[PDB]
Structures are given as C-alpha cells and as structure tokens.
Symmetry: D2
Subunit: 209 residues, 4 copies
C-alpha cells in the first residue's frame, strides 16, 4: 500500500466483537460438575504440526496440496513426524485442568487413517496424561469403515469440544454441545487463518501458542 500509512487512536483501540474467555473462566464454569468426556481437535489445537505438513508438501506436492491425498505422506505423518510437532501451552493448561477434574480426554482428527499410528503416544507423553484419562486418537472421516466427527462426539457423549477450524465449531453446534475456539498460529502453513469467533463462540485468549 502506502509507504508511510501512519495510524490513529481510533484504529489502535478498535476491537472486534468477540467473546474471549480464559482457561480460569472455563474451569470456574465447570465447578461442581462430575467427570465428563471432552474432545480436542489435534492440528493447530493441541499440536503445531505444520513442520510435518510442510515437509510432506515439499516432498510429495511442491506445487499443490495433493500430498494430503498421498497414502505415503500419511504413513510418515502418523508414525513419527509428530516428533517434530510442537505442543501448545494453551492446550497444556486445558488438559492439566481436565485431568485434575478426572475427565476422559479424547482427540478427534481429520487426518487420514493409517494401519499404525504413534500420535496417541506422542500426545500422552507430551501432555503427561494419566492412563485412566487417556484414550486412543480417533480418526474421523467419510470411509464406510469409519464414523464422522459429529458421530464420534455423540457416541462418546463429549460435552465440550476444542478446535481451531470452523468445522470443529459447527460440529459441536450440530451436536448441541459447547464448542470452544483455539487460535491458529500465524506461522501455521494451513492458511488463510480462520476467523475465530465467527459463530459467536467463546475464544480462548492467547491460545496461538
């Protein structure tokens, strides 16, 4: 645009009409409630997994997103490339809180399903989730050999679902449960960034890292 655009105080103080919440406010809203099932999307919600997707694109589809359909990519991505995935501090705070409550934690992902996967171990180890609260990662999809995200949220009776994408939030709305938005990091390779708060949902402050 212009070389020296400058700014003004109206612009400096301008706020988007979003419902921001803190982990502490979420915990307070659960006070007294017995243990329950809660779910988390994985990519850009609990793990900054762009390193692996970046390498996959470079290796299998330098000019496009065809790698997301390449079975070879998914073998690598679900069996070791998450050793390069950086866990999010906001996720750590949320999981620690749910673990203290004794809730059952589920991870639901849209990644393609492979015969073997080490993602579940990576998550339990990185977030130090006790055996009683941990559950194997759930790969949701269209395949007749699997169920959709909405179906899993309902089957496990999850009461809250955390995610960074719009479809994570609409899935929760469709099931009539509490959908909470996590901010996607600016350096994620999954762009454009989504508009957090676009459905009037609660958005966790400072959740980009």
């Amino acid at each position: 645009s212009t070389l020296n655009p400058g700014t003004n105080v109206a612009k400096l103080a301008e706020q988007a009409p979003v419902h921001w919440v803190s982990v502490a406010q979420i915990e307070n809203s659960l006070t007294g409630r017995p243990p329950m099932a809660v779910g988390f999307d994985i990519d850009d919600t609990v793990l900054f997994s762009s390193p692996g997707f970046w390498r996959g694109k470079k290796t299998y589809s330098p000019d496009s997103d065809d790698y997301l359909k390449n079975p070879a990519f998914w073998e690598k991505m679900n069996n070791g490339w998450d050793e390069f995935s950086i866990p999010k501090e906001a996720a750590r705070q949320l999981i620690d809180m749910h673990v203290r409550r004794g809730d059952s934690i589920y991870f639901v992902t849209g990644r393609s399903q492979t015969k073997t996967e080490t993602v579940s171990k990576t998550l339990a180890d990185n977030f130090h989730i006790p055996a009683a609260n941990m559950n194997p990662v759930i790969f949701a999809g269209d395949k007749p050999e699997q169920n959709t995200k909405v179906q899993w949220l309902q089957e496990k009776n999850m009461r809250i679902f955390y995610g960074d994408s719009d479809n994570d939030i609409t899935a929760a709305r469709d099931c009539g449960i509490r959908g909470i938005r996590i901010l996607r990091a600016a350096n994620s390779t999954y762009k454009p960034l989504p508009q957090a708060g676009a459905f009037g949902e609660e958005v966790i402050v400072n959740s980009e890292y």
Copy 2:
C-alpha cells in the same frame, strides 16, 4: 516507567484480556422478536462526554478536591447550561437510534444531584433526536455513600437493560436481575481512574469510547 527502551514482543502484542465484547448489531439481533420495553442509560461518560463542565466546576469550586461534587452551586450550573459544552458519544447515538426503531421507552438515570430546574433532558432529546413518544425526563438519582441510588429506579420503571460506564451502573443492573451493558469511559475523561470494563463478566460494547 523507569526503562528508557522497554521494547516489546509478539506474545505481548497479541495479548487479549478475557472480556465479552459485543457490537450494537449483535445487541439488536439478540432483541429480535422482543416487544417494546423500557431501557435505561447512565448519562456521564455513557451518552455524553461531560468532563468539560465537571472540569470547570472543580476549578471554580474546589481546585484541590472533589468537594465541588457536594456543592449546590455547582449542580445549578452543571444542570442548566454547561452541557452545551458536553460532546455526544457516537456509540450512544447508535444505541439510542436502535432502541427508537424498536419503539422502546428510553430513560436516563444519572448520579448527578437534582436541582430545581434542569435543561439536560432537552439537551439529550435534541442531540439524539429522540421522539416525544420514546423520551422521558431525566431521573436525577443523586449519589449516597454505602448505597446504590439507581436500583430503585430501574425496578420501578421495569427497565430490562441498563447501559453504563461505571461499576455501580453494572452492579445496579445485576442487583435487579436485568441486563447490564458496559460503555467504555474515554481516556481523556477527568473522572479517573478509568474503570475496568468487564470486571463483572458483563458485555462491553466495542469502540464505545467516543
């Protein structure tokens, strides 16, 4: 405060307070289907930037303190002409227009002291073009210590929503079990310190400082 070059970082730049921000459009949308009702507005730093008169009052009657706020002579001047210097807030214009469209009955409940005569009601009706059908003379609730003077009025007029910039405006609404919505107090207001909007978990209107 004592650091010449404090610098900054991106975590700090993107840092957000956990506040429930709302827009006039969202408020309006949340009222769809609701029949006409009574709604209330605080005046100072809510619909009018009235600091000019309070500043002149302080300098005239009590340069070193806030005793002017208890001075009958100050209120006479403030309520009968000094608001000619008070600047209407744009955020208030938008809210008032919206409520007029809904056909709601509008009330102004202020902590200013009541005087024999007052020209504030007319100043408000004129500046915000409020039709006679929606207007109501300003209610001067006064301000007593250890007590919230506004509660009585919100109850008796059956106000369903109350807009205000001070904590006592929000707690008044909470005491009545109605919807209290916060308006940001301008940074150049002489009424300091600025309150912490959202301190009761209430809705706060974006960009409402002007």
Copy 3:
C-alpha cells in the same frame, strides 16, 4: 455479518510508525543548551473541542462557517478554554522543557482577536514560569500576520509539536524536528489524521 471474528495475525498487526516516549525525547536532548521549542494548541496541549462544538451549534449548526464568525472567536479566545481539558502528554512535555530551561512558544491557527485569555489559561494550567512563557502567537495568511513557517524560523524553534499534518510539514519545511501528538478519538475535528504519515516521530499514549 454479525460475527466478523478475528485472527492472531490481525491482533498483532503493527503499523510501521516511529513511536517515542517523552523520556526518550529528553534523553535525546541531553547536553544540549536551552533552545526555543513550539507547540500547536488545539488537540496538542488542549482538548478544546468543547468550545468548537458549542460554537458550531450556536453559529452554524449545518456547516463550519462558525470558523469565519468573528463573534465565535471572541468567545473562544476569551473564556471558553475554561472548558478545555489540558493533555497529560503535553504536561509531561512542558515540564521537561521547563526543566531544561527551554523557551516555550505556542503557535495557533485560531483567528486573532483584539484580546485573548488563552496565554493565561496555558501558563496557569501548565504552571509555566514567566521566564519560559511567551504570549500565544496567532498565525495566518493575513497581511498583518506571518504564516506558521515564518514564525518557526523567526523564533528559531528547533522542535515543533502538533497533531495535524500541517504542523509536521511546517517543521519539515524549516528543517527542524517535527513530533506528532495523537488527536483524541472524541475530538470533533474529524477525520483523525494519520500520525506517522511523513515518517515522523509520534509520542505514545498522547491522546490524553
């Protein structure tokens, strides 16, 4: 759309502006002998919108002709600034220059009037010693008055503070240091200017 939402890139986005604090300005002048510095008045040291607002409502509700009404200026320059709110940023800047022993000048584009109490209101609100205080200078295109630029050169002002683009370009035209002050969002003089539009230094939190 009722819910536009936002994202972290937008939340952390910064305009390329050269921000400075009063402390940094003071530090940049260490060891320098007392000099002459000037300040714009409206929205720089005083939030005078109250008087201009009343003036417009009184003399030209539908336009800005009140700015041409000598009746308005008589009121504005002789008492309506008692309703003007001094700016904290200006207070800090003025105190700093007084401590340095600098010579303070106020240059305004307000219309000149036979008498004025503005100089008094300024010296009183900012506690400016007589030694550093100078009567307000009214500039303009009249034959009996010099323009803003000419006044900066004549007094050899080395720094000029202002909220408007013309305050900064005047400084630029004289080869001196022009420093921008933010105009408050509730000022009636709209639209707000783009502080930093000339690559100049802008004082932080100077909207109040």
Copy 4:
C-alpha cells in the same frame, strides 16, 4: 482475578518502539549500489524450533544441555531443517535484496559440523540466485573460527538482520545497521527477547 476487565487507555497503549516495514527499508536504500548484508538464521529466516524441540526431547528433555551435544548438531545441520518453516518476512527481505543485486550472507551461532545441508535448504526455499548466494558462515569463539563481529567486518556487511539481542549488539559493535526480526510466540527458544531494547528498528509483522 477471574474477570480482570480492561480500559481504553490500556487498549491503545503503545510501547515506544521504532517500527519499520520492508518497503521503508527498501526506500532508505534508494540509490545505493549493491552491498553485502547478513541474516541470522534461527527465528530470523527459519522457524527451526521443530528440530530444536526434537533434539531437546531426545538428548536432554529437562534442560538445554542438548545444545552442547555433538550428536544433536550432526542431525540438526544435515536434514532436520527439512522441517524448518521459512518466514514470510524473510522471504520479502531476501527478494528485495536480490532485486537490488546485494550479496546475501547467513551467519549462524549453531555448532559447526563436518558437513551441512542448511546452505542448500536456504538457497532452495528462498530461490536465491547463485550470484547472490554465499555458503552459511558458522561463527563462534573457537580458535579455528572467527567471531560474528569479525565476519560482519570481514565481508563488509552494511546491514545485519536478527531476532536476538546479540545479533543487534554485533551490528552495533561494527558500526553498522542492525535490524530486529520478531521471534514467533511458539518458538521453543524462550523467553522472547524485547525487540527495540536498544532503540533499533524492528520490522512489523515479522513473527511469521
């Protein structure tokens, strides 16, 4: 407290930092013939935390001792950068300098290894022309190496870009222009530094 709230003075508060854009940096170089410029690597041109994270988890999960493990560096310098994400801000800067015909140098504090594929990774991801590309320089305190300052002086670099305080001080010690890049909030190298702590220029939106 549970509901701390906020106020407009806090919402508009700005730190006194000298922000600049890539366009402004380019403008400031108008007319200057080709020159040498240098870039720090980690968190400046590459978000390399993925490799540093895996190394930490592998060699010293509870400390930074992995930074002195030869086994770590062998893997980090010979392939783990295939997981490093190039920064958009660096891409723009590099494209701008390549267009000017400047010589681009990359100086790193990473431990030197017998071989390295970092140079190849950089040249490929940023499409740097052979005429502007130079092999990565590993600076350090070892007797076989030269310090960062000596390298900047040796190659006569006029500008040095970096995210850490030591990148800026190196430029300051050489009398050249040191420009700060923002370190991403999700970098594993914490705490984040205070960009602008030396009054240096900081590039806007350079965290990605």
